Write a protein that binds this ligand. Structure first.
Ligand SMILES: Nc1ccc2c(ccn2C(F)F)c1
Lengths: 179, 235
């Protein structure tokens, strides 16, 4: 089992902490959802290759530009997250996060991940977004942004229901394994 | 880590740590506030455990088994004794607040009502000046430490056997040398998230809401000072 490193980046409300928790526990916490994620080493077998994938979060580091890059050394794959119920978190991807991740992690594959896809057909979400003249991110808007920033791929998932979560991390392992 | 503390913090939440009959006696809001306070102490216990792996297992093992030059070991684990001293003191005060709160005849049922004052003390005065000075030095030496580690691992065979030996047990799966360094660096930025969620469920007593609000600001001031005093050293 080779060792690879994964770092999740994105705005505070992109749902990156919850994605790391649901993946590591293989369950959406029934009794208590933790506020923080420390670290985890996942045993993943993708395409017949066994990998030890270390998972890291950047939550809490968004306002601290000199503390935050300390999470980047030797990263093998970046999960660049945004929330499907938040068109604003998608806007910050090519402006702030992509130039930072390409400067500290040159040549590292990036997977643009659209979180909270369950809210794309949630009525409370649709009514709330209309007050600010917005609507949920469409799957093609995500694909276009992923193409624009030169991401390795574009994927979607829902931490609430676990749908698409295993595939995100299995594709990250595949990307981390490539030259 | 000691068996007493590990057992007290083995459960995934405060709601599962306390007896079911005691849990039923509390309002939903108190259960939520206690769940987040328990998470803060449980993650602090894990953090102090991480610094003990660095001092006793790695640092000490390199000095005694490998007989490595003290300046080399210092380069690898900068400020580890000062860091260990800051958080073992903080953890002691948190577990003593839990201990005083225990119901008579019980080793698990408790409710902490005054966390705010403990957080204001920790993130103010001399203890805040020491955290700021220590993390500014540790974080500024982060890259130099990883570079020194990679060099030693790739050039010395006895160092590689040592690392493979001490990190072999399953209880060390997430705690390699570089993993421990990033765990410690990321610790300080976890506090505002934990304090804010405690504050969200602490509106019952106005004094507590004010203390936690002051504490949140002192943590953010500290983080801003550490962030501004960082510059990556390069050898
Ligand atoms: N060229 C360059 C240099 C440093 C950068 C970026 C984007 C973020 N940072 C960093 F300082 F946070 C871009």
């Amino acid at each position: 089992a080779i060792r690879k490193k994964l770092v999740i980046v994105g705005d505070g409300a992109c749902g990156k902490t919850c994605l790391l928790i649901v993946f590591s526990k293989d369950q959406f916490p029934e009794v208590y959802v933790p506020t923080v994620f420390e670290n985890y080493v996942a045993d993943i077998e993708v395409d017949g290759k066994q990998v030890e994938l270390a998972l890291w979060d950047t939550a809490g580091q968004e306002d601290y530009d000199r503390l935050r890059p300390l999470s980047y050394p030797d990263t093998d794959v970046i999960l660049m997250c945004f929330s499907i119920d938040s068109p604003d978190s998608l806007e910050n991807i090519p402006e702030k996060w992509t130039p930072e991740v390409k400067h500290f992690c040159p040549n590292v594959p990036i997977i643009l991940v659209g979180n909270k896809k369950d809210l794309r057909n949630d009525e409370h979400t649709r009514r709330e977004l209309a007050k600010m003249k917005q609507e949920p991110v469409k799957p093609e808007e995500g694909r276009d942004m992923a193409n624009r920033i030169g991401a390795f791929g574009y994927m979607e998932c829902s931490a609430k229901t676990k749908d698409g979560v295993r595939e995100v991390f299995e594709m990250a392992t595949r990307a981390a394994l490539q030259a | 880590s000691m068996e007493m503390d590990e057992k007290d913090f083995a459960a995934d939440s405060w709601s599962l740590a306390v007896d079911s009959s005691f849990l039923q006696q509390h309002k939903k809001e108190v259960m939520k506030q206690q769940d987040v306070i328990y998470e803060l102490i449980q993650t602090e216990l894990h953090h102090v455990r991480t610094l003990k792996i660095m001092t006793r297992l790695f640092r000490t093992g390199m000095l005694e088994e490998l007989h490595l030059e003290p300046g080399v070991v210092q380069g690898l684990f900068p400020c580890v004794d000062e860091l260990s001293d800051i958080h073992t003191r903080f953890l002691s005060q948190l577990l003593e607040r839990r201990r005083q709160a225990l119901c008579p005849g019980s080793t698990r049922n408790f409710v902490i009502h005054r966390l705010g004052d403990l957080l204001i003390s920790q993130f103010s005065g001399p203890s805040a000046e020491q955290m700021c000075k220590t993390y500014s030095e540790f974080c500024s030496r982060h890259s130099k430490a990883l570079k020194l580690y990679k060099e030693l691992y790739a050039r010395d065979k006895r160092f590689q056997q040592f690392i493979r030996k001490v990190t072999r047990p399953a209880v060390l799966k997430r705690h390699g040398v570089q993993e421990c360094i990033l765990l410690v660096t990321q610790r300080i930025t976890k506090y505002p998230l934990l304090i804010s969620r405690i504050l969200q469920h602490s509106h019952g007593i106005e004094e507590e809401r004010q203390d936690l609000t002051t504490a949140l600001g002192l943590v953010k001031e500290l983080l801003s000072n550490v962030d501004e005093g960082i510059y990556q050293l390069e050898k």
